[PDB]
Design an enzyme around this catalytic site. Sequence first.
Site, short mmCIF file in Angstrom:
data_model
loop_
_atom_site.label_atom_id
_atom_site.label_comp_id
_atom_site.label_asym_id
_atom_site.label_seq_id
_atom_site.Cartn_x
_atom_site.Cartn_y
_atom_site.Cartn_z
N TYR A 160 0.82 -1.20 0.00
CA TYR A 160 0.00 0.00 0.00
C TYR A 160 0.87 1.26 0.00
O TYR A 160 1.94 1.28 0.60
CB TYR A 160 -0.81 -0.05 1.30
CG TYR A 160 -1.88 -1.14 1.33
CD1 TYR A 160 -1.60 -2.39 0.79
CD2 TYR A 160 -3.11 -0.89 1.89
CE1 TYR A 160 -2.60 -3.42 0.82
CE2 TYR A 160 -4.11 -1.93 1.91
CZ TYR A 160 -3.81 -3.14 1.38
OH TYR A 160 -4.76 -4.11 1.41
N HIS B 184 -1.87 1.36 -3.43
CA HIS B 184 -1.89 0.61 -4.67
C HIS B 184 -3.24 0.81 -5.37
O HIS B 184 -4.21 1.24 -4.75
CB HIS B 184 -1.57 -0.87 -4.43
CG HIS B 184 -2.64 -1.61 -3.66
ND1 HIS B 184 -3.79 -2.09 -4.26
CD2 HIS B 184 -2.72 -1.95 -2.35
CE1 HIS B 184 -4.52 -2.70 -3.34
NE2 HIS B 184 -3.86 -2.61 -2.15
N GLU C 82 -5.80 2.99 -3.34
CA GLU C 82 -6.38 2.67 -2.05
C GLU C 82 -5.32 2.77 -0.95
O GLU C 82 -4.20 2.28 -1.12
CB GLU C 82 -7.02 1.28 -2.07
CG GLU C 82 -6.02 0.22 -2.51
CD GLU C 82 -6.59 -1.19 -2.31
OE1 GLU C 82 -6.49 -1.69 -1.17
OE2 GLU C 82 -7.11 -1.73 -3.31
N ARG D 91 -10.47 2.77 5.12
CA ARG D 91 -9.48 2.92 4.07
C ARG D 91 -9.86 4.07 3.14
O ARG D 91 -11.04 4.24 2.80
CB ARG D 91 -9.34 1.64 3.25
CG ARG D 91 -9.05 0.44 4.16
CD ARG D 91 -7.54 0.21 4.29
NE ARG D 91 -7.19 -1.13 3.77
CZ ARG D 91 -7.03 -2.22 4.53
NH1 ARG D 91 -7.19 -2.13 5.86
NH2 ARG D 91 -6.71 -3.39 3.97
N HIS E 276 -14.17 -2.12 5.57
CA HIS E 276 -14.46 -3.54 5.56
C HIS E 276 -15.78 -3.80 6.28
O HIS E 276 -16.08 -4.94 6.65
CB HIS E 276 -13.29 -4.34 6.15
CG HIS E 276 -12.16 -4.58 5.18
ND1 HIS E 276 -11.35 -5.70 5.23
CD2 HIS E 276 -11.71 -3.83 4.13
CE1 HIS E 276 -10.46 -5.62 4.26
NE2 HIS E 276 -10.68 -4.46 3.58
N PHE F 234 -14.61 -3.87 -0.19
CA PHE F 234 -14.68 -2.56 0.43
C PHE F 234 -16.03 -1.89 0.16
O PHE F 234 -16.79 -2.35 -0.69
CB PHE F 234 -13.56 -1.71 -0.18
CG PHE F 234 -12.19 -1.92 0.46
CD1 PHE F 234 -12.02 -1.71 1.79
CD2 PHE F 234 -11.14 -2.32 -0.31
CE1 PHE F 234 -10.75 -1.91 2.38
CE2 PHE F 234 -9.86 -2.51 0.29
CZ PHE F 234 -9.70 -2.31 1.62
#
Length: 104
Positions: free
Chosen positions: A38, A40, A58, A77, A92, A100
């Site tokens: 990350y 990415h 993300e 996120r 999540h 997501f």
Amino acid sequence: ACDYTCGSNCYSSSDVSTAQAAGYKLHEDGETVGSNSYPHKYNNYEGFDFSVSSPYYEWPILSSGDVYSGGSPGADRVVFNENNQLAGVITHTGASGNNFVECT
């Protein structure tokens, strides 16, 4: 003016930015954080209304307003691009697995 509450958050597009700056910076450097890769790409699809242009990157969002540095940041996120924008606020939140979903 929290606009993106990931169930247990409160960081509007103004808060996300901070998180992004992290994903971007590291992104612009082509580096990662933690054991993962990350930030990415995040080529949305689940049905995200990213008022931003791709590609979408993300990145995790720390409710503390810090810069993640691991593989398991949390449901919360942030997604952005290579411009320094924010795709939105995914989580999540029982997305139904590792999927997501834009926070609330």
